[PDB]
Amino acid sequence: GXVLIFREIHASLVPGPSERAGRRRRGRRTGSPSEGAHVSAALAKTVRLTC
Helix, strand or coil: CCHHHHHHHHHHHCHHHHHHHHHCCCCCCCHHHHHHHHHHHHHHHHHHHHC
């Protein structure tokens, strides 16, 4: 699949509950990759489709 993308989806998982607890404001470095991680979420649909 793409274990790293598994990390990407896992990367969106973090901002979900954690952002609302601290990253609410700051985080202009992890928030960005998280967005791409979402796109990675779709690709993930393909990685899963793959292996």
